[PDB]
Amino acid sequence: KPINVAIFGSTGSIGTNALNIIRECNKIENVFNVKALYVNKSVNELYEQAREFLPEYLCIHDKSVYEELKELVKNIKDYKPIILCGDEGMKEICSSNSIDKIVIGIDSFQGLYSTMYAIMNNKIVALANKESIVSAGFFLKKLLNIHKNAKIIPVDSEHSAIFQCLDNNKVLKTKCLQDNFSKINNINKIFLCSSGGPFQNLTMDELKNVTSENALKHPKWKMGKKITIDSATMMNKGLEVIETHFLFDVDYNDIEVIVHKECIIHSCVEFIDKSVISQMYYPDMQIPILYSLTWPDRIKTNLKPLDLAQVSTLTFHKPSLEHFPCIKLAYQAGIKGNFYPTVLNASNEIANNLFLNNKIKYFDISSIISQVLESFNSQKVSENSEDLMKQILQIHSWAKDKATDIYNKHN
């Protein structure tokens, strides 16, 4: 009974890590079939992955490299995949009855589109992309209410940890990103752990002048550029607070960010009796990815065992909101609700990219995001799913444009 999986964003950090744990898992016993691979424009790298995994489907988003892809794959003998392009290609893969689970390793708001179509096709969605949940949580909840057999299984490491800390006897009565989830699961409060990022010990004077080169250098594992910058600003953790709220139905007052620099405890769940359960491992994404594909079971691996005497010390401290103002902006946006999380995500996408490209300074990131949030006024939420998606898109686009306009003006 092999598990038929598609990897969306297969050439990025998540996608390559997913293919690695799959490869390793299969050597112990052949449990996964890699049925589809989808990328944006990394045509040479997708070709190489195609030669190794020989999926039934290949898809490339950028039309300008589709012909190139076909020409390359011609060089793989005895291999006749279905080779698709763009939105229509993604939709065709999601509607295939040969695919059971889809790993969403596409970055940014863009990952919402495939997330939505995977749910609409009643698939198990092993969701790493958090911008989708932040920007469109209420929408996704409505979609999941309609598509009974669709499920989001969280891959983001902290949310995987939380999910692993739950009793599946209770989980199986509901599913993530549903009303009443915390009540059913007896959840009282979440400790959302953070690495703290590379800037965690810097002074205010030092933060003023940090660069994106400083944020990107010497990663534990290479993550994509966007998340790496968000880790440095701790906007990642702000996004993950909102993600927690939506996935697990936890009030913002019951989500506490804790800086745990060793990254061994990945997050913790306090139940209503005050007992706390936590998930622990070395800093890795292989367990989150694997668990999303095996849940509700676990399978044998040969991963390096955790050794607590080796670790020796685990530390916890609260983050400074003066140093990391993005965290507070995320809580404020989440608490306001409505489309404020959409605005938060969109403005951050622009500010993150500006800092990445050395156009603005560290504290300008939070300044831009704050100004966009203050400029937004709540809208009535469309009652129809199609209109609600259009409204999310329009607000996301406006907020990106507003961020860019603020940048353009101070120049």
Ligand X SMILES: CCCCCCOc1ccc([C@H](SCC(=O)N(C)O)P(=O)(O)O)cc1
Binding residues: 11-14, 40-42, 130-131, 156-158, 195, 218, 224, 231, 236-237, 240
**Pattern 120-159, Mn ion, x by CB under 5 A:** ------------------------------------xxx-
Instruction: Rank residues 157 and 347 by Cβ distance to Mn ion and give the closer one.
Output: 157
Q: Closest separation between CB of residue 26 and its own copies, Å?
A: 15
Residues 306 to 335 in contact with its own copies, rule: CB under 8 A? 306, 308-309, 311-318
- Between CA 213 and CA 225 the distance in angstroms is 11
Does 223 bind ligand NDP (CB under 6 A)? Our answer is: yes
Report the residue from 2, 272, 401, 410 that binds its own copies according to the rule CB under 8 A: 272
Enter the tokens of residue 87: 């939105």
8 Å CB contact between 248 and 214: no
Report the residue from 64, 145, 168, 394 that binds its own copies according to the rule CB under 8 A: 168
Does 149 bind its own copies (CB under 8 A)? Our answer is: no
Does 61 bind ligand X (CB under 6 A)? Our answer is: no
8 Å CB contact between 114 and 102: yes
- Convert 172-197 into a string of H (helix), E (strand) and C (coil): CCCCCCCCCHHHHCCEEEEEEEECCC
Ramachandran sector of residue 81 (left: φ over 0; alpha: ψ -120 to 50; beta: rest): beta
Sheet holding 151-154, edge to edge: 82-85, 57-60, 32-39, 3-8, 101-104, 124-127, 151-154
Does 49 bind ligand X (CB under 6 A)? Our answer is: no
Residues 56 to 85 in contact with ligand NDP, rule: CB under 6 A? 61
- Using the contact rule CB under 6 A, the part of the chain among 105-113, 134-142, 267-275, 319-327 near ligand NDP is 105-113
Residues 47 to 106 in contact with its own copies, rule: CB under 8 A? none
Residues 153 to 212 in contact with Mn ion, rule: CB under 5 A? 156-158
Q: Which residues pair with 85 in a beta bridge?
A: 60
Does 283 bind ligand X (CB under 6 A)? Our answer is: yes
Does 169 bind its own copies (CB under 8 A)? Our answer is: yes
* Distances from the Cα of 247 to the Cα of 37, 272, 336, angstroms: 26, 18, 17
Instruction: Rank residues 148 and 274 by Cβ distance to its own copies and give the closer one.
Output: 274
Sign of CA dihedral 334, 339, 342, 343: negative
Does 301 bind its own copies (CB under 8 A)? Our answer is: yes
Amino acid occupying residue 300: K
Give me the DSSP letters along 196-240. Answer: --TTTT--HHHHHT--HHHHHSS-SS---HHHHHHHHHTHHHHHH
Residues 188 to 207 in contact with ligand X, rule: CB under 6 A? 194-195, 197
Residue nearest ligand X, Cβ-based: 157
- Cβ neighbours of 203 (radius 10 Å): 8
Out of its own copies, ligand X, ligand NDP, none, which partner does residue 105 contact, by CB within 5 to 8 A per kind? Answer: ligand NDP
8 Å CB contact between 17 and 285: yes
DSSP 128: -
Does 280 bind its own copies (CB under 8 A)? Our answer is: yes
Applying CB under 6 A, the residues found at the interface with ligand X are 156-158, 194-195, 197, 220, 223, 227, 231, 236-237, 262-263, 283, 285
Instruction: Please give the residue ranges that form the binding site for its own copies (CB under 8 A).
Output: 164-165, 167-170, 172, 186, 189, 191, 258, 260, 268, 270-281, 287, 290-291, 294, 296-301, 303-306, 308-309, 311-318
